[PDB]
Design a binder for this molecule. Structure first.
Ligand SMILES: *[P@](C)(=O)O[C@H](CC)COc1ccccc1
Ligand SMILES: [Ca+2]
Length: 320
């Protein structure tokens, strides 16, 4: 152990949709990451928010995170925290940074759909094809139960329908209007914004990176085929030991056929851009970003634990 990742302010990891700090109280969302960071001298806390909800609103993940941030500060005696969110977690972090700027020192998003997800649009579109609308109710009930059951604390505040809408591209654009950020570029520009922001007199260091394992590699008869660049073609063990590898390749293919361009199976490169874009070259699918499942990744995928560890050091050197 050492203090390679010893940051001034406590680090809080923020999970995305379907998440919880510890699935069924057994499998941790940020697989092996909290242990690694702490071994390197960092003070880390893992948020436990609704796996299914919008980010804003009375019952949203945003207010949940705000309240959690406050308990972390009170317990540590620190005055600010570094927010590190994955997927939707990044949106929840942006919410706290905006409404409570004085409590945040930095915001880092990993594969966060700042502009929404083409796969979210897809899934929502699928539900709309049921003229009776009953599938929304039935499927929502099923997902909500999954949320309650997998939540480490069996949080009953789950709203799959609101979570799905929150992640669509049209809704994401609206979210960015209500919660503007200097770290965001112009919509439809596929560009990032500034590396830092000053809200209400409080400066925040902004960072981000994305996984682009799923690449468009061939187009024929209007159809676009992709390639999972995270794996060694065909024989990669990650395809057998991690069920999400191929699943994400499948969802990633649906996205490129919806005009997403390179992605990680859930979030496009353009949608993930925020603050200082450290990288968008990682050959990662959406779950490799959080060292999942159970630390399995394709042969060509960079080590997610090391990347996050190095960032903690980056934050340290930056003064936060
Ligand atoms: P981010 C968007 O929170 O990703 C989740 C896995 C961590 C799942 O996101 C979705 C959203 C809609 C349809 C499929 C997956
Ligand atoms: Ca994986």
């Amino acid at each position: 152990a050492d203090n390679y990742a010893a940051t001034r302010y406590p680090i809080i990891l923020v999970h995305g949709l379907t998440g919880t700090d510890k699935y069924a109280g057994v499998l941790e969302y940020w697989y092996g990451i909290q242990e690694d960071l702490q071994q390197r001298g960092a003070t880390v806390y893992v948020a436990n928010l609704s796996g299914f909800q919008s980010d804003d609103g009375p019952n949203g993940r945003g207010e949940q995170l705000l309240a959690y941030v406050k308990t972390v500060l009170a317990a540590t005696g620190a005055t600010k925290v570094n927010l590190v969110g994955h997927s939707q977690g990044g949106l929840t972090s942006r919410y706290v940074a905006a409404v409570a700027p004085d409590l945040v020192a930095s915001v880092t998003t990993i594969g966060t759909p700042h502009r929404g997800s083409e796969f979210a649009d897809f899934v929502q579109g699928v539900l709309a094809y049921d003229p009776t609308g009953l599938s929304s109710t039935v499927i929502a009930a099923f997902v909500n139960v999954f949320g309650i059951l997998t939540s480490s604390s069996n949080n009953t505040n789950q709203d799959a329908l609101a979570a799905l809408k929150t992640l669509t591209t049209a809704q994401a654009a609206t979210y960015n209007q209500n919660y503007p950020s200097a770290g965001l570029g112009a919509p439809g520009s596929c560009q990032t914004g500034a590396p830092t922001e000053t809200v209400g007199g409080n400066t925040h260091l902004l960072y981000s990176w994305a996984g682009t394992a799923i690449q468009p590699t061939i187009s024929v008869f209007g159809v676009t085929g992709a390639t999972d660049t995270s794996t060694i073609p065909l024989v990669d063990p990650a395809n057998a030991l991690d069920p999400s590898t191929l699943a994400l390749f499948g969802t990633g293919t649906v996205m490129v056929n919806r005009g997403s361009g390179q992605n990680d199976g859930v979030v496009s490169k353009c949608s993930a851009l925020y603050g200082q874009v450290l990288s968008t070259s990682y050959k990662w699918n959406h779950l490799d970003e959080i060292n999942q499942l159970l630390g399995v990744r394709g042969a060509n995928a960079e080590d997610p634990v090391a990347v996050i560890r190095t960032h903690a050091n980056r934050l340290k050197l930056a003064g936060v």
